[model samples]
Target: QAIKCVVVGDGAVGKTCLLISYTTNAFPGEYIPTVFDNYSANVMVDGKPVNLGLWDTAGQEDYDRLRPLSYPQTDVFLICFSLVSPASFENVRAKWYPEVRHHCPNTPIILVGTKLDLRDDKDTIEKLKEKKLTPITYPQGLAMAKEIGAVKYLECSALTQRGLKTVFDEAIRAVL
Candidate 1:
């Protein structure tokens, strides 16, 4: 059986990066927003070719209403976010999770925090110095994962290929 996995998240959260990293094992600096409602890829797993359909739904408030249509047939859902952005984390439960449950109650869900490579870099240091704000850590992301009832939480750096295997392996196993 083929498993259709949907990748959903707010804009600029590295959804495209995660998708390309997992599917092609390559990362690009620039990504064009997906024009179509869905994108599909084929992967060979355990001698079987499975079609992985990634539904990149728009993240705007107006587009959120279309989630019911986008999520209905998903076997697994990947909700991506940026670790530096608290709002993205907050939305996973308040907006994304409920929408998925309402549309596809049984679909397994994974929460991913992308851009881990840059978490402790110059930009983060600047932000911390300027705003005196603490950036998100892995433990906090894991806690949020538990709160949201996620199958698992993964901290991935699409740029550096960190934790990529565990994320995709867990996701594919869940849906398979």
Candidate 2:
């Protein structure tokens, strides 16, 4: 069976990098996204190998028209955002959830957070400080999940490949 995991996040928030990080089992230090394809992973599971499909969607206002087109049959929705970037979080609250809900009313959504490893990175912290902001706390994500009735609230960073394994498993496990 194929589980369609649709990943949606605002631009520059590492949506492509996050999926590639899991599919390749390699860190995506930097990724450039253009027209794209869905990424799948073959994993060894309990002596059985399984495949995982992670679908990615571009984030932008103009893209919104077609964005709705893909929402129809998506099996599981991964609503991701950036940790240190406030706009990513804000937009999901205002745009992402409503979009998913309006289209797939029976589906479930998970609130994902990218840039997890960098939460404590000295440079990342410094960047957040200089901007008069701070890294998004886990509590913040949980709150949003609760507010939006998200199925899960999770965080990870493709730049470091940390916390990526579970995402792959969950996306596939969800179908079973």
Candidate 3:
């Protein structure tokens, strides 16, 4: 009947935006860092009603010690990264996977790649090209999900709200 889905990822990777988009049905006009917040919704998933609790956590080093405080009793986890930022993608394995596994080893994790809209944007690609970097591809994301033993891998654009609903639905299904 209830599921606690906690999201963890590098700062500014659009974790908050993803939650805001799904919960409020609109994207924020500006980027606001999340310290900690809880969002809940009663929705039908796969013909069953679920009380889903979404937990937002700070991703900065300042909250390294505080982040795990919300890890207890989590039903599922969304370990997110930006498709436009390879570094954030790298952290999905090096940082996030280890952090969550330490606290909730048995909990199912869903690997998420955010900012799908910018992955192919002209300016975003050009800027990354200047730095000799490139966007994270879908295959790369899937491979990482496999590497981390995640239950599933998904990519979403919070601004466009594409693939956002599936993210939450899958979280509930994973718990069910």
Give the TM-score of each candidate. Answer: 0.86, 0.89, 0.98
State which candidate, 1 or 2, has the greater lDDT.
2
Highest lDDT against the true fold, candidate: 3
Q: lDDT ranking from best to worst?
A: 3, 2, 1
Which portions of model 1 show Cα errors greater than 4 Å? Answer: 29-31, 41-49
Clashing pairs in 1: none
Model 2, range 26-102, lDDT digits (tens) per residue?
66555676344678777765465675566778876668887877777778889989997888998888999999988
Per-residue lDDT tens digits of candidate 3, residues 1-176? Answer: 98999999999999989998999998888988898999998889879999999999998979999999999999999999999999999999999999999999999999999999998899999999999999999999999999999999999999999899999989898999
Error of 2 at 24 (Å): 0.8
Candidate 1 vs. true structure, TM-score = 0.86
Candidate lDDT scores, in order, read 0.77, 0.79, 0.94
- What alpha-carbon RMSD in Å does predicted model 1 have with respect to the real structure? 2.2
Report the alpha-carbon TM-score of model 2 versus the true structure: 0.89
The number of clashing residue pairs in each candidate reads: 0, 0, 0
Model 3 gets an lDDT of 0.94
Model 1 lDDT-worst window of ten: 34-43
Q: Write the per-residue lDDT of candidate 1 for residues 1-176, one digit (tens) a residue.
A: 66777877777788877777776778867767654455666766667677767666666666665556766667888888888777787888888888878778778889989888878888786886687666678898888888878898998888888987777667777877
